[PDB]
Amino acid sequence: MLMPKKNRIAIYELLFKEGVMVAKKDVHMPKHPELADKNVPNLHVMKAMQSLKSRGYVKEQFAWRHFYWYLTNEGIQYLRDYLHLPPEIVPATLRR
Amino acid sequence: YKIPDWFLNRQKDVKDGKYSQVLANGLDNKLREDLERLKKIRAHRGLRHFWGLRVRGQHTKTTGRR
Amino acid sequence: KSYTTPKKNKHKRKKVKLAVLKYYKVDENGKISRLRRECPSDECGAGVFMASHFDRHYCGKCCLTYCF
Amino acid sequence: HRIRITLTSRNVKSLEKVCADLIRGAKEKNLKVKGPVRMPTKTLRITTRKTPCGEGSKTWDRFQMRIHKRLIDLHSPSEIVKQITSISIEPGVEVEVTIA
């Protein structure tokens, strides 16, 4: 899926801000309900996330019509390397 | 004699733009013309009339059996 | 299975090596001989050059058009 | 001061013992109360075919869902009501409190 690097980085940052991100299975919904400011389409979310699923950086779950993605440890390292953040700070799921 | 336009059988006629209740031999001669117009212009409605079929969106599969 | 009417030829990109070399003409001194017109738009300023068409002029970014 | 509780439930006995426990709270602190006014039950009704296809004799499920609705009118101070409404409520019950 060819998509702007602006969108792609607003996806990966949002996955790293929490340790979790969701999306409804609707290709045609032109604005993701969570990330509306930076106009990321909903299919960019699904394809950018299934990319991480295929090479096993993120855990998959699906109920009724909604995707639920959980960030895993090697995916955490990939994202702080691919976003270039401090290795001090973690996603908001290792915070108690 | 003041019977309004909505009360007539031939309202806003195609040849003359006229409102008038058209009676027996007139109505037959003007019915003939209304079908023979649609026959001449090759319009679906008249083609249905020429083949002796039901035109107004019926299902002919089961009904209209001679 | 076997269809009669032959398939549609797909678009291949006409890649042009050093397309910046055509956009400008470098001078002997530290200056420019910019052949192409710059797009006088708000979305794109002095960066984007217009297209040198054979019966018009067209911008490739903001889709602005100027005719002879 | 004329403060109106609107209790709504799916299950009777759960809403019946709550409306009783709120009217306890009105008598334990001894302020006047119009009793548990019984608003009519709402039987929501979905009558769907049983078969996922249409390939049996034409049977139909007849689902209901009863919604019991009670209301309690008090002549109370606001803080006594916000105290009593917190005490001993259970998942079957749904409580509104209108001031005026």
């Binding site: - | 806003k12 006229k18 001449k40 212009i41 090759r42 319009a43 | - | -």
Partner: protein
């Protein structure tokens, strides 16, 4: 002997008439169709056919300009044109003599094949 009409108006009087006035002449369905608006949607293919009809060449019956649009009213503007009305199979050629005003384009091309019956 006599020249074709519409309601009580001649063709150049039909052609010399705004849509605001063209409404109140032909039938209720078409009046509504015109009143609903001139198309800003993908159905501006109505207007694109209004541009493709206005490529009338020098003296002969014009070339076949095809459409999928069956939902189009035969205006007096159209009359005399040579249109290809689509069925699924055939772009049927139709020369639109002026008695066809008010009717739809698809009203002149059968989308079904006429039935005959065998054993």
């Amino acid at each position: 002997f006599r020249k074709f009409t519409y309601r009580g108006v001649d063709l150049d009087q039909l052609l010399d008439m705004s849509y605001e006035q063209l409404m109140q002449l032909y039938s209720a369905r078409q009046r509504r169709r015109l009143s609903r608006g001139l198309r800003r949607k993908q159905h501006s293919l109505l207007k694109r056919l209004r541009k493709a009809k206005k490529e009338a060449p020098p003296m002969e019956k014009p070339e076949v300009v095809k459409t999928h649009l069956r939902d189009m009213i035969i205006l007096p503007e159209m009359v005399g044109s040579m249109v290809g009305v689509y069925n699924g199979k055939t772009f049927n050629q139709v020369e639109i003599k002026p008695e066809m005003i008010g009717h739809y384009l698809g009203e002149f091309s059968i989308t079904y094949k006429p039935v005959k019956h065998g054993r």
